[PDB]
Design a protein around this ligand. Sequence first.
Ligand SMILES: Nc1nc2c(ncn2[C@@H]2O[C@H](COP(=O)(O)OP(=O)(O)OP(=O)(O)OP(=O)(O)OC[C@H]3O[C@@H](n4cnc5c(N)ncnc54)[C@H](O)[C@@H]3O)[C@@H](O)[C@H]2O)c(=O)[nH]1
Ligand SMILES: Nc1ccn([C@@H]2O[C@H](COP(=O)(O)CP(=O)(O)OP(=O)(O)O)[C@@H](O)[C@H]2O)c(=O)n1
Lengths: 226, 228, 48, 93, 52, 49, 48, 105
Amino acid sequence: KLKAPVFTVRTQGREYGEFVLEPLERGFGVTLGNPLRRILLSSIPGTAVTSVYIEDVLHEFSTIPGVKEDVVEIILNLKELVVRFLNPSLQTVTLLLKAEGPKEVKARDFLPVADVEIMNPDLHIATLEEGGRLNMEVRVDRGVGYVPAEKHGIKDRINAIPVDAVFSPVRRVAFQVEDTRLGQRTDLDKLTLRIWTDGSVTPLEALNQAVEILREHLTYFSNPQA
Amino acid sequence: SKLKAPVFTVRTQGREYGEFVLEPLERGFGVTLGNPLRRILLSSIPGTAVTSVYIEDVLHEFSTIPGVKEDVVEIILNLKELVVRFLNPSLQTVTLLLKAEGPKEVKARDFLPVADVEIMNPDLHIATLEEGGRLNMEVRVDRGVGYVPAEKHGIKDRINAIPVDAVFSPVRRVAFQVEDTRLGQRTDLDKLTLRIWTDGSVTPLEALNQAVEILREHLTYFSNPQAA
Amino acid sequence: YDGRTGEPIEGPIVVGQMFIMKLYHMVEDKMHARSTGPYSLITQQPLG
Amino acid sequence: AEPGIDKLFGMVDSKYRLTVVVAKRAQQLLRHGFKNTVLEPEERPKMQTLEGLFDDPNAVTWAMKELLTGRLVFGENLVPEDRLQKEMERLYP
Amino acid sequence: DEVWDALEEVIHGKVVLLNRAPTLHRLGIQAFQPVLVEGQSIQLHPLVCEAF
Amino acid sequence: GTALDQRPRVVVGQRVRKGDLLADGPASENGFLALGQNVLVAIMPFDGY
Amino acid sequence: QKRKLQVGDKLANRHGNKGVVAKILPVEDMPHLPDGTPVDVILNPLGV
Amino acid sequence: VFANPDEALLAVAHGIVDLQDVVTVRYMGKRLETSPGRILFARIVAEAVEDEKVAWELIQLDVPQEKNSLKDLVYQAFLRLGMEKTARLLDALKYYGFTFSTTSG
Ligand SMILES: Nc1nc2c(ncn2[C@@H]2O[C@H](COP(=O)(O)OP(=O)(O)OP(=O)(O)OP(=O)(O)OC[C@H]3O[C@@H](n4cnc5c(N)ncnc54)[C@H](O)[C@@H]3O)[C@@H](O)[C@H]2O)c(=O)[nH]1
Ligand SMILES: Nc1ccn([C@@H]2O[C@H](COP(=O)(O)CP(=O)(O)OP(=O)(O)O)[C@@H](O)[C@H]2O)c(=O)n1
């Protein structure tokens, strides 16, 4: 046989991670990389902005006097808002934003709420000049994966605009399998996994969650109910 | 929004065919479970194969035996199709003895009985002998994994033994099907069906269990971070 | 279907039986290397 | 490509001059057993084997890296060859 | 076994010249770092085939 | 350098008519020219190999 | 000698398509039909 | 309408859109009506040359990439960056071209 492999970690901040597993038996590199990639892109729980309410706008293709950006731009900026829930009981959260005067509206202008943490207060939301106003109501849920706005279409109020829900805290995953040798054997595998997240969960935590999900699903082949 | 444990259903045909159904699954998980299991089943399931052959008054594989229609190369090709089941997990190697005299149709059933060893295809044709032909064979069968060519292991018991390429995998074919299913309000859910054809030495359920164990052991490896 | 991932190839693929032969040009008979060896009589150059 | 090949090509007026300088520096390194190098131990070119990290045995790599460091002087009629050789022996036995 | 490791030590950093006849231009000979492989066939990069 | 052998294609007691095949020659399958193998092929690019 | 197919050997069909074997893949990596049957040879369409 | 290339490629990974479908993506502070495939090609070049502004300058986004455009890209990358980065970009292009030709069908 062959000895147990070595697992190596290289983390950049809490936003980038590289993971190296070597050596592996022939063909196991893709066998491990592909399901992990699918789970990472599909099944890691997270939070996302789901709905938005702005007054005096009837649809997403309108505009607000007093703000340089259109509705689409502020919605797109809201798509990158990262929110972390600290207690497991919290499910949905409503955030209110009040803005007046010539100012640079970021995330920290959101009013504080218990057991909700904003991870990017420096994210740019809007620009107001003199005499401009912005009152915003954003509904944030928790889910998994990517759900388009038309699929859920949940709008708290009659004027609320559904938003594409980027639930996945993982932004990107790539992986590469490279040939490696050990002693006389020369057909072994080395697996490299690169993960970019949004910061709510570190890449190592996301990888651990994906591995745990795969292990739980493998447990399912045990009891032949029928 | 956590999903309930899916139902696992088993259908079996003999010791050679198995269908294993898992339903319902989250969208996209059918491939995520089926493909690695298919790769492991086709790659890493241990089995048994003929690894060495010794024939009387035969010095090498490129010869003929008087009274025998087939030359040694064709006889070894026939012997590579022999399916041998080891009843004892601790057993590693066995040597089957065959002695025959013409005229007859020497099949796999003519091998002398051995304890804790079964021949799963006794009807497999081995040779044709005419009047005056004699066949004396010692066939060494081993446990192993994967495909090992004769030039690699080079196993010889006696001086005149002929090493034989060993294809240890007992699994013949693997397929899996992902079908549409749903559960109440959830839609676009997956139903996974694994179809396994083996040669009878290992049942499809046993191979599936070993594949699950291999995948779990390999998933275990992600638990010891090291700094670079 | 792709054996590495299990996902299908994005388009249908032409598949069928073909008759293929092995040619006598084999790499076993052609691979050759030399560090030093015999030399020619007159020119004292390596043989061919 | 070789690391910093553009820098080396820009450090000389003719690419063949760069080749000549690299070859001569490599010969100097080989003659003295790498004792005349201008590299400090942390910049030394390393090679990975089963036993462990060792020094890179290829002298052309050493000479190229040294040329990247910029501590080497090259030109026409800098020092008479005999005096250079004698001093090289005296400093490095 | 150790002689193969010695061989890996020998060729470290060195290059070899690959040539395909007919050598119509100068790019019919090119220098490459050798990676030791099993088998009896030379492995060539896809992007140099047009030059060769 | 190729090996040419003839392999019997009949059994003892078999009835043979005139011109009936008795033994296959090299590169022959039951009296048909057999220069290669029938394989399942897919026409597609594959990873640059 | 009993020679098996290896990398570098030349194969051809009857219509003038020739090529050397450049890669031998394991069975689990080859493209397969929905019933689980893998293909034996992959030919590049760019030669047609 | 996608806020960044990562979102568009995530939507591609979920089967929402194809690589050849024309959508709206926000890239480099601008709103481009393009396809996820062309955004992916731009990202490939940018990561190969380790320079986003120069890579954006080099590529022609609004055309399918064919022999002439790729050759012009290689020449311009040579001129702007040097042999080392040009070779790195060449290797990246070879890898991704092979990968996408395999699964294209
Ligand atoms: N510079 C160069 N490159 C060539 C040439 N011709 C082919 N290539 C390359 O080789 C690849 C495969 O070409 P092929 O698919 O044609 O295969 P082959 O190896 O040439 O073999 P044959 O089909 O000719 O078989 P044979 O039994 O007739 O060989 C025995 C008879 O052939 C002739 N012959 C055999 N070998 C050679 C050789 N080395 N040089 C010249 N004549 C040769 C000769 O007259 C001999 O007396 C092509 O793509 C090209 O890269 C050539 O003239 N010059
Ligand atoms: N006497 C020779 C014959 C061949 N050659 C070399 O072999 C190559 C292919 O010729 P070839 O005839 O084998 C094929 P090609 O023209 O590339 O194929 P296609 O149009 O059917 O696709 C030529 O381009 C020359 O470099 C040579 O140097 N001297």
